[PDB]
Amino acid sequence: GKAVAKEDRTTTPYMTKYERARILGTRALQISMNAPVLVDLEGETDPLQIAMKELAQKKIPLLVRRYLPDGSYEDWSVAELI
Amino acid sequence: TSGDPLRGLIQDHVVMGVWLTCKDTFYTRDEYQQLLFQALKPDETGMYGRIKTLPPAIQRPGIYWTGKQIISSVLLNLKPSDRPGLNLKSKAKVPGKYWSPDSEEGSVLFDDGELLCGILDKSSFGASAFGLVHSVHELYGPDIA
């Protein structure tokens, strides 16, 4: 296997309609299990919409691994996606 | 299967659309405000503080808001923070000759988000593309459509 280097990355810089849903889902689960919230709350209660508030400001961990059909994969920071 | 949209209003709403956007309609202040607030109902949905209106189409000898102004008013209250108004030109379902010989209604034209001429019917909002609601879906994103 290979971990494609940061200099040359051929995948789409857009946060695909799917990576957004799963990033928000897993961040919501994490925050639901007593994880650190990286952004000031204004009184919102649902352990998910907090993740929406995090993603609106791009203050979220959890880089994603995009698995190309070769078997290789890219490592994209969620700050790095568009 | 095809781009043609599938959601959209049905029988009663669209007949009352032909009857509301028609140009022989007129409202006093009370009916305008009341009908608008029935349409918006912000509190159950949220996100908005105070409802804003238009000036009246006619002002003397009695002040009267017209129907197309109610449609423009709804569009004005649902405009996002900073997106310029909608502007569009598209044929409507009720053919132009039914209203008059060389009638003007025919085809809805509306610039910067105010219904300038034309009436809304099954082609405008409903299971028909390139109308009002589909263009709102294109400009202002789905959750606003």
Added chain:
Amino acid sequence: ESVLLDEIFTVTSVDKQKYQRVSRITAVSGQNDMNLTLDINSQIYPLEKDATFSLQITSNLNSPDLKEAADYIMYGKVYRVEEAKDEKVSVYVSFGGLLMAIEGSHRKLYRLSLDHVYLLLRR
């Protein structure tokens, strides 16, 4: 002063087609080089054939002219301005549905823009 028209008009035909309320009237006047066809609320401001006008489209309605003159006031955007067939312009003013189309020879119809209007019709 922001007045954009002062022309006196005279009506020639009225209809009143499938509408109990507003009726389209055609009111060619001047030296026939001013072709105006608008709609009016024919329930609260009636007009017959050959009734005289005093039509002005202003920009801001702030003057004693509002109170003294302007027996009937509408309001609306002018959405299409064209110059066709000649040095002769045609303006289409919408009033929230009740349309209006005024054809004038690029003078006395110069100051027209694409903004709001405040039409004033006093008999």
Added chain:
Amino acid sequence: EKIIILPGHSADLTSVTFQIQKEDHTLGNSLRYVIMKNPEVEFCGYSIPHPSEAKMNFRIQTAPSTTAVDVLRKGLDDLIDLCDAVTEKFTEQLP
């Protein structure tokens, strides 16, 4: 909890939405009618969330001169005066 102020009220308390409990159009429409008779109001239109429950969303926005709660109070007083005028004329009619 008869009357409460919904979470959409402006800080100046000028654009506020009372929610009258256990009422339907019977009072809503009448009070809206009387409130419109007030010059200093810009907007007044009532609704109903869902006919299953008895709650009436009200809504009153006014010019900065007078807040909205004073408008609602004056309007209710005027509607009471109207009811009293009607009952006086009615009672005086028949012996």
Added chain:
Amino acid sequence: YSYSRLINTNKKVYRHVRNGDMLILNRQPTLHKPSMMAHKARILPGEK
């Protein structure tokens, strides 16, 4: 036993649906994908 994530877990309350929970709707036969959607629930009183 000596596998210590039992201190990190939270106490899970099973809660009822409420006015924001997203609960799928469907209809058999579900031919094409717009036939199984997910609506927000609003909880009305009274009717069955």
